[PDB]
Every structure is written in C-alpha cells, then in structure tokens.
Write a sequence for this structure.
C-alpha cells in the first residue's frame, strides 16, 4: 500500500524524462544525470547502471528517447514536431491511462517501444533528410582528403608567392 | 557594388511578400499533459543546454529578408561598409585624404 | 597564437567601434535637446 | 524577452499606422497561452512573433512601398542620379567656394 | 594587440548604458 504512493514520484520523473525530455530530480535519486562541466553534447548526459531500479523496464531505451528529445528540442530547435509528439503521447499516458503507475508492464514496454521507433524515425528524417548527412560527409572526404585535385592545384598556383 | 546586393535582396523580398496573404492561423491541440508538463519547483537542469548552444550562424539570406531586425541590420552593415571602405575610418587614411 | 582567418578581425572590431561612436553622439545630441528645455 | 517585447511593439506599430482598433477585419483564428506551466510557451511566442513580423513586413513593403524609398534615399544621398546635383553645383559655384 | 580594441569596446558599452540610464532617470523625475 505504501509502495504505490512512494513510487509514484519516481514514475513522474520518468514521465517527464520520457515525454518532454527533461530532468526533474535535483537530488541524486535517478539513473540519468548531467555534466555541466562537459563541453560536448554526446557526453554531457551519462547513465548510471548501478541505480537502475528492478521495477523499471527498457531502461536503455528510456535513456535514448530522452537524449534524442533533448537533442531535437534544444539543438535542432524543431519545436513544432516535439509539441505534436508531446500532445500525442500525453493523450496516451494521461487520458487513455492514469500515468505510468497505472500501466501493466507489458503495455508500458510496448509504449516505450513505440516511442523509440517514432523518435528514431524522425531523427533520421531530420539528420539524413534536411541536413543531408551523407552529402556533407562526402564533401568532407572530397575536400579534406584532397580528392578535388584541381582546386588545390589552383590554390597552389595562385598562392605560389603568398 | 555594395548596393547591388541590397537591391537584389529587397526585390526578392518584395516578390516573396506579394504572393503572401495577410494574417496567419495558429491551431493547437487539447494539451492534456497537465502534471506531465508542469515541472513545478525551482527549475529543470535543461537551462545549461540553452547557453551551450550558439546562434551566430545565419547566412544565405534565403527567400529574402524575413525579420524586420535583419532588414535594419542589412542597411546598418551597408552603411558601415560604405564608411569603412572610404578613406575616412583610419587616422592615416583620413589625414592623407585631408591633405590631398 | 590566435588563428588567422580570411575575414578581417580588426576590420570587424573597428566597424563595431565606429557604430558605437555614432550611437553615443546621437544619444548625446538628443539628451542636450532634452535637457535645455 | 526580446521576442515578447518586439512582438508587442510591432503589433502596436501596425495598429497605430493603419488605424485599426483591433484585428477583427482580418478574421484570423488565434490560440491563446493556456498557462505559464504549459510546455509550448516557446512555440506560442515564436508563432506570435512570426505573425507580427509577417504583418509589419507586408505593411512596410506592400503598403508603405519601402523598396522605392530605398531607391529614393540612394538618389538623394549618394547621387545615383547626378544630373540635379551637378546643376546645383553649377548654379552656385561662386558661393560654395567662399568662406 | 586587439585586446586594446576589445577593452575600448566594453568601455563604450558601459558609457552607452550610462547614457540610457540617464535618460530613464530624467524621464522618471519629470513625471
């Protein structure tokens, strides 16, 4: 009886992290943390495998969902789709059900799987879509690895005195 | 030579706005998030990311000028270019021009 | 040493100072017009 | 802060210029901020700012003919058409060179 | 060398801020 209300706040932390992609616990009581001292995105956020509770499932997918959400709504600044996603999955967590606590483990795992697939689908549709990751990697190889020898010959002949 | 760029940009912006209606409709969902969004307290630890990112990368003047702030900034940069290119910004160049 | 780049660093700083000298003097003229009344 | 202040100022400029008391004539559908704790506050502010820029931009360009004001400033100040100023100097050549 | 230009830039930033604060003070007092 006491464990239900004692665990509800933990599930609220997980809810905020899963849906919007933000960290609430000011104290050290969660298996996801930040590093303000770090100066690169991929390593500001790190996981704590020792603190993963036994009653949580698909933790390694929760971490990726939250990290990709932060990346989308703070670096790519794609607020429109993030808001649409927030509404769509709040209509399942809080309207269809009564929160993460009021969800059987099977349905909770299924929900996290659906969120993971959707999030990575959109991340691909941006990074390898609008950004054209492959084209820019090809251009990196074209210029840094000397491929367009004509351009460099032009630079050297023009700058032979400078 | 500097004015050609502004002339082209302003013509592009005029053509862009000519075909654009006045007034835009904004829609929203029912927003059932409630406690899943309140995040009440002091604040979240996501404030660091806003400062970490930078927004000094804006170029290509795509589809013309889209914000009045850029509209003012373009002309301010143009005037600064006119003053700097002319022999009036340095002290050596201005002194030599005055003597000549 | 600081990296050299195609864009003129000193030119940018000088233009900023000149633009900060125009704002200051225009503000001073406006304040003079405001005070004397 | 800058977006909020500039959105409000731009709408105020539009109202004071075109004389409208309120934007009823446009009959546009608008959504208001439901709460301060809502997650889409930044999105709503961005949308409002874009609406204000859209209106003020179209006012300046289509209504106030700013593109032609740029050419007029070019002519009058930088002599993109030097015939008139040449006549002026010719007419008052003796005066201009005096102390 | 360019440290000196940056120093002058910040000095003029402070001077401009002071002038604007002077305007606000004057207007507040006149009201």
């Amino acid at each position: 009886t006491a464990f239900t209300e004692v665990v509800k706040p933990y599930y609220n932390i997980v809810e905020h992290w899963i849906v919007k992609g933000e960290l609430i616990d000011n104290n050290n009581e969660f298996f996801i943390i930040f590093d303000q001292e770090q100066n690169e995105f991929n390593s500001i956020i790190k996981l704590l495998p020792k603190k993963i509770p036994a009653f949580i499932k698909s933790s390694d997918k929760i971490f990726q969902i939250g990290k990709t959400l932060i990346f989308l709504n703070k670096y790519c600044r794609e607020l429109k789709w993030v808001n649409q996603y927030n509404v769509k999955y709040s209509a399942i967590l809080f309207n269809n059900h009564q929160g993460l606590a009021s969800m059987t483990t099977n349905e909770m795992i299924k929900l996290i799987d659906s969120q993971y697939n959707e999030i990575l689908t959109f991340l691909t549709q941006i990074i390898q879509g609008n950004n054209k990751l492959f084209t820019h990697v090809y251009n990196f190889k074209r210029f840094y690895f000397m491929e367009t020898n004509d351009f460099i010959d032009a630079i050297m002949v023009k700058g032979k005195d400078v | 030579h500097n004015f050609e760029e502004i002339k082209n940009l302003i013509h592009t912006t005029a053509t862009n706005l000519a075909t654009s209606e006045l007034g835009s409709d904004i829609n929203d969902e029912g927003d059932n998030i409630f406690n899943g969004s309140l995040i009440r307290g002091t604040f979240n630890n996501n404030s660091i990311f806003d400062s970490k990112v930078h927004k000094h990368r804006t170029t290509t003047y795509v589809e013309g000028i889209s914000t009045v702030e850029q509209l003012i900034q373009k002309f301010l940069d143009y005037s600064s270019t006119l003053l700097n290119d002319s022999l009036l910004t340095r002290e050596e160049s201005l002194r030599q021009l005055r003597k000549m | 040493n600081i990296a050299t780049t195609t864009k003129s660093r000193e030119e940018e700083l000088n233009k900023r100072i000149v633009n900060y000298k125009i704002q200051l003097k225009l503000m001073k003229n406006f304040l003079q017009e405001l005070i004397d009344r | 802060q800058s977006k909020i202040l500039n959105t409000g100022k731009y709408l105020n400029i539009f109202k004071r210029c075109t004389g409208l008391h309120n934007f009823e004539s446009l009959k546009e559908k608008l959504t208001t901020i439901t709460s301060l704790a809502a997650p889409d506050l930044e999105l709503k502010i961005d949308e409002f700012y874009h609406r204000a820029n859209k209106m003020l931009m179209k006012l300046l360009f289509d209504g106030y003919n700013f593109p032609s004001v740029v050419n007029i400033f070019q002519r009058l100040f930088l002599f993109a058409d030097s015939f008139q100023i040449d006549n002026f100097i010719d007419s008052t050549f003796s005066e201009l060179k005096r102390g």
Summary: The first helix of chain D runs from residue 2 to 18. Helices of chain D lie at 2-18, 41-63, 66-78, 83-91, 93-96. Chain D touches chain B at residues 6, 10, 23, 26-31, 34, 37-40, 44, 47-48, 50-51, 53-58, 60-62, 66-67, 70, 74, 78 (CB under 8 Å).
